[PDB]
Amino acid sequence: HPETLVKVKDAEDQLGARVGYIELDLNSGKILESFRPEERFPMMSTFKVLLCGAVLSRIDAGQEQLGRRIHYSQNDLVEYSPVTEKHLTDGMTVRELCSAAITMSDNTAANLLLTTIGGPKELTAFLHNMGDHVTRLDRWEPELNEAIPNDERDTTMPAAMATTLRKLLTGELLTLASRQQLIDWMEADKVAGPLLRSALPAGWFIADKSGAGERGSRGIIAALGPDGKPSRIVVIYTTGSQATMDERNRQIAEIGASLIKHW
Template sequence: MTFIFKAQVSICNAFLLSFLIHIGLAGSARANTILEQIEAQEHLLGARIGVSIYDVKANDSWDYNGNTKFPLMSTFKVLACAKLLADVEKGLQSFDTATVITTDSLINWSPITKKLVGEKISLKEACSAAMIMSDNTATNIVFKGIDGPKALTQFMRAIGDEFTRLDRIEPELNEALDGDKRDTTTPNAMVKSLHTLLFGDVLSRDSKVQLKQWMIDNKVTGSLLRSVLPEHWFIADRSGSGGFGSRGITAVVWSDKRTPLIISIYLTQTDATFAQRNKAIADIGKAIFAVYRK
């Protein structure tokens, strides 16, 4: 586990740099608070867990299995909608492009689109449904609008992320087979990419505001980090779940007194119940907040 201090460079090139200074945290009581909670949850769930934390103002990071691959699950939806925003800015796509919802197009977990059979949904509305309610049919509409998983992977490479990859659409991308490189990311890669998208210059100010607002308006993460968020703090997040006990969340948290903190937590390969996995993420989040609110 290390705090990592990086040279000040453009965010889009961050993945190309080596970390310059590494300061061991083995003796740090603050870091051990987080480490002990993660290891306890790994033992309790029999899971593999990865965590990455980036303090935006201090420009330092901490991770546990930060460079280990984990299934992306629905955390990728923030990336897909970011690409749509970028494509709209470039004139390659329009928010108003519409698709008719059909019964045949509906897949599992489509709480918004299942009510719209026979009606049209725009790409902007589809992103809203995908981000706020994790609607999978809407997500596949977004996929079509951004030219599919391969194009999204190319977008990630273009913004400096050499690790995150999308290979399939919903629901197959959530398969989460152990050792499968398809549809994966690393906690560090996701944190850095979220930093690039929300704080860098890949997107315009208006697009960054929209992306962040979709994450703020998320309605399906109440039992995760939101359940242990310190009083007067704010959160913008996107979660995911998949096969083999996979669960994940990527988030930005902040307050009037605390500058933004970007967090990614992923776990996989466990027989734990959905509720147990949610509690594990919440407990890890609680430990993180206990350290970083000081």
């Protein structure tokens, strides 16, 4: 809706940073609204959805099991590992690592899952093979969040990320059981409270994944809609702002309030 595009441009003014935005129809894949849809932004933790999509693909192909238990050590732990730091002695299943990567944005969980598939270049190969020639992961947690201006490492475009999420959640790319598990993890997201969720009324469905990185990098990818069912994909990225985490959260929430108002 044009009023949401007015709020996105307002967000750019308030953050002194570029904001990338796209709304897709979840059913048709048609673009409903966009701003800087083909400009590159750091993915930050939004890649953790794509990573668990790669993992589910392997499970579907008989190359991985949700139930396989992975043991790791003190020196695997990176910054912001709220689940993985508690399981040094017992390890975690692939299921638990995907839950921790998507629902809690656990960085060590993402690194351990990247190791299962052969690292960032294999996630990029997975994305290439499903027809996304833009989205690329180059680095591990936490360096992938560096958000150096004009650096194309660890980036996507709003339009590419939206299309890729739609193909993961509704395509034939994953089995019905894998699609359902990926959206169930995103629906259980615990760390996106101050973003689209804070504008979302009771009765609406949202499955999302947030991102934060350096240089004011902030983003969210979501499948949402009224009446307890997703019907649209929303992707919001920003990078370059000096604004506080609270101000970046408020701008994304206000884009959310406008998207809901003008649904």
